[PDB]
Amino acid sequence: KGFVPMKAVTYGLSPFQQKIMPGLWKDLPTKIHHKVSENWISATLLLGPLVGVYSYVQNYQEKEKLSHRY
Template sequence: MGKVPVRLKEVTYSLSPCHQHIWRGLLHDVRYKTMKRFNDNWVSALFLLVPVLGSYGYAEAYREREKLHHRH
């Protein structure tokens, strides 16, 4: 069987110069903006982070216990 050439269309997406300028402005002071948000809403951040990190720690400890349990 011979090879049949197939024509492909290439589509390139890019941001317009105006949107690139806005995007750079959004990422300009990311560290300052996140720290300001955290300082303004630290109680909400704790209520979000503590259960997530606690669940992750519990799951890791449980997985380790299961490994050790099946080892013997």
């Protein structure tokens, strides 16, 4: 647990000299599109098996119930 010699240069500005809130809602649709396009595969892989198993169980149960009738 130690540190390293670095050699960098940085500039900063005071907190009380810059607008804070307007950054949240600036350009939402492009951010939403980027997130969706990047994580569509993760969403698919998370939500696939649940839907498949649920549909299969529903179909099996209704078929069995309707086949037990008179």
